[PDB]
């Protein structure tokens, strides 16, 4: 993004193929962009054929808005995003280094870190199984006549999580460390919709299946700390060389927070990575762009310098409310209405950064290189 914005977008090979088909369809005049993607294309000068696959992908990602309720405010047609665009945006993840100012507890339960922790976030959109209008792209993929299909849900989460796991397996090796990864109940909140009573065992089965399938590609990943809060039994499972842990903090007293080192890891031996349950249509942090420290997405963004990594501005952590605030100068001269979404609008900030793809060999590369092979 702007000057001091450091984040990296990632997507799978299968997602890249969807982007290539969509770009080709547009080049032939056989498809029509949704309202918001149409707006981003209108504001730049390149025709579809002139732009490379990376620029095209970045512009589709740029159509995301800071705050969107994907489960209730989207129509899945031309008036906002089409199903073809939605299928691509759900597969896009974004990682960034962050300072973590508290352990990420919801509400008033957060524990401030005496010294803020240096780690990483990986925002990944969960399976969207709720809609205020027609069915969603994820529904058409993982639901067979109404049944959640465990195998299809597995393939969905493998598509979206594996690029981030490959990134942080490689990042840990670069730092002569292992990786400790904390995972929330991704897609088990509002995204589950009518499937709230079956989704949570399905999600951990998907996590286990991804780690079991790709254990030989993740030798520097050591600990996976999965915390669905409630609705699951505590357990530990050795998966190859990795320790997979189901530690529901609402059932087990003393569980380490999502933005904290799990048992058996420390800053000398491990890098700390937290997965964030993201949203097809929103910037990283979603709700907190409107000042609401709510949901896993908004809690983790408010409890990190996420908004500083997206905007390039230097915020100030409010240790009484557990939220990373905009610069004081902004929250005084525009004191009443000065959340991070207001800063974005006043400064013309857009969401747009480098993007890589996971090729068939398990390496992250430019979209141009992965498409040519």
Numbering used by the authors: 37 to 409
Sentences from the paper on this structure:
As full-length recombinant MavL behaved poorly in expression and purification, we chose to proceed with MavL42-435, a construct that was recently crystallized and its structure reported. We then tried to capture MavL in its ADPR-bound form through co-crystallization of MavL with ADPR and soaking MavL-UbVME crystals with ADPR. Interestingly, the same R370-involving protomer:protomer interaction was observed in MavL crystals obtained from co-crystallization trials that failed to yield bound ADPR.
ADP-ribosylation is a reversible post-translational modification involved in various cellular activities. Removal of ADP-ribosylation requires (ADP-ribosyl)hydrolases, with macrodomain enzymes being a major family in this category. Further analyses reveal DUF4804 as a class of MavL-like macrodomain enzymes whose representative members show unique selectivity for mono-ADP-ribosylated arginine residue in synthetic substrates. Crystal structures of several proteins in this class provide insights into arginine specificity and a shared mode of ADP-ribose interaction distinct from previously characterized macrodomains.
